[PDB]
Design a protein around this ligand. Structure first.
Ligand SMILES: O=S(=O)(O)CCCO
Lengths: 173, 173
């Protein structure tokens, strides 16, 4: 069971703008079954970069793209959960990491990040809805205002309001 | 938990910068090191890799990996190195000569052939004659800096080799 290995976005599927792009679907029992096929890439005529489980139609949708790909857009649906293969979510930072979408959720000194949706331990105004496009989801390290320090988070230690996270620059020579 | 790490057999790491944090503990198995690393509990840093000393049954947890500036990768028959995939760059610079991620599937979704195997395809891209190239397992690699990026010999007898679909670091904003 490889499902916990994917970055999950609730109530979301992906749509092609490009009719050219390819999709594979199969009726299935559980979301874990979509995950296994994606991880192993068995019987897909492409590299599985993401999949959707449709909980109403009991279907996997396997994709050679993700939510960051050109010619694809997110779509809302109560029945869908999106799972993006972490191997195709850039895990290094460009510049100050304004566009960082990876899942690192621990600070430089090893403190588990506080969820953006929470006011515990720390009250703050980085509400996800105020910061659209900045992916203030779960407790991921993010740099929503593009400050000098790189991605950071509020910390689950009450004595440390916030700390930078230790995410490498993609290229610095 | 151990499968979200890239394993390098017979390898440890040495820190030349003495200010870099380390934590060690005698354990039973490498799986237990992986668990503490993934959960990052009781570690005053971000766990980016660990080594398991099979002789002493000791975990060595690191806030660095083999690509970190000033770390000595060294042979040792009793060590296995495990690098957290979140910290191995999963995108390509230029032609991907330096790609060391764990993607093992071609663009058309075929499982790569192991570099050390000669079935289905016979070749002269042996690990031994490509030191530093990490021609390990069946990972997509670009040892000669060739145009289309990391590639592999394919497990499909009808397709000698094909490029993989590893994104450029410049692909996404
Ligand atoms: O101003 S806050 O303390 O709320 C966050 C600052 C981190 O840049």
């Amino acid at each position: 069971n490889t499902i916990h290995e994917f970055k999950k976005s609730a109530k979301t599927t992906l749509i092609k703008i490009d009719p050219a792009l390819k999709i594979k679907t199969k009726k299935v029992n559980t979301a874990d079954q979509c995950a296994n096929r994606c991880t192993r890439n068995k019987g897909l005529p492409f590299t599985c970069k993401a999949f959707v489980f449709d909980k109403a139609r009991k279907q996997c949708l396997w994709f050679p793209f993700n939510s960051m790909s050109s010619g694809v857009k997110k779509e809302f649906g109560h029945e869908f959960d999106l799972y993006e293969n972490k191997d195709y979510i850039r895990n290094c930072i460009i510049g100050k990491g304004r566009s960082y979408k990876g899942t690192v959720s621990i600070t430089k000194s090893g403190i588990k990040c506080q969820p953006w949706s929470s006011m515990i331990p720390h009250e703050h105004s980085f509400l996800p809805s105020s910061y659209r496009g900045k992916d203030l989801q779960e407790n991921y390290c993010r740099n929503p205002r593009g400050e000098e320090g790189g991605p950071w988070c509020f910390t689950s230690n009450p004595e440390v309001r916030y700390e930078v996270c230790d995410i490498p620059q993609c290229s610095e020579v």
